[PDB]
């Protein structure tokens, strides 16, 4: 179950998508995010992505709809997770480093302290090596 701190973190993630701060994520904003993460969805693809999440059918994603998606996470999806992993593991060595995570967050327009980046890595790190491997990443997502 979600906690206060975790809901507040998902709200911060939502604000990285909601570029114009109007409280909804549009296809355009989703496209911007996806491209900043190295993906190249078409217009129709973006519409399909929003449609999966858009509970009230208004064509945009509000925070309760975003949180509804995040709450459930993934369940028993393989290939999308490897693609997401590769977004972060830009050198391809199989480990997400704090520098790699910070670079991603900077491309999304989030400026974080070193403490904050380390805290993020710590939350997903299981073995304590200070990096996130794929098995760790899968467990975070599911």
From the list ligand SPU, Ca ion, none, which binds 123 (C-beta under 5 to 8 Å, kind-based)? Answer: ligand SPU
* 76 annotated among ligand-binding-site residues: no
Does 98 bind ligand SPU (CB under 6 A)? Our answer is no
Number of residues that bind ligand SPU (CB under 6 A): 30
Closer to Ca ion by CB, 77 or 93: give it: 93
* 91 annotated among ligand-binding-site residues: yes
* 48 annotated among ligand-binding-site residues: no
- End-to-end CA distance of the chain: give it in Å, rounded: 13
The Cα-based distances of 59 to 13, 28, 32, 43 in angstroms read: 20, 11, 17, 13
What SS3 state is found at 79? helix
Q: Provide the minimum distance between the beta carbon of 142 and Ca ion in the complex, in angstroms, as a whole number.
A: 16
Cβ proximity of 65 and 52 under 8 Å: no
């Amino acid at each position: 179950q979600l906690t206060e701190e975790q809901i507040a973190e998902f709200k911060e993630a939502f604000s990285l998508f909601d570029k114009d701060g109007d409280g909804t994520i549009t296809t355009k904003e989703l496209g911007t995010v996806m491209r900043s993460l190295g993906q190249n969805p078409t217009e129709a693809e973006l519409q399909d992505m929003i449609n999966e999440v858009d509970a009230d059918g208004n064509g945009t994603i509000d925070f309760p709809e975003f949180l509804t998606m995040m709450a459930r996470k993934m369940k028993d999806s393989e290939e999308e997770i490897r693609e997401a992993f590769r977004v972060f593991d830009k050198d391809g060595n199989g480990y997400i480093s704090a520098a790699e995570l910070r670079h991603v967050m900077t491309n999304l327009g989030e400026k974080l302290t070193d403490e904050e980046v380390d805290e993020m890595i710590r939350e997903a790190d299981i073995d304590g090596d200070g990096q996130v491997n794929y098995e760790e990443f899968v467990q975070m997502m599911t």
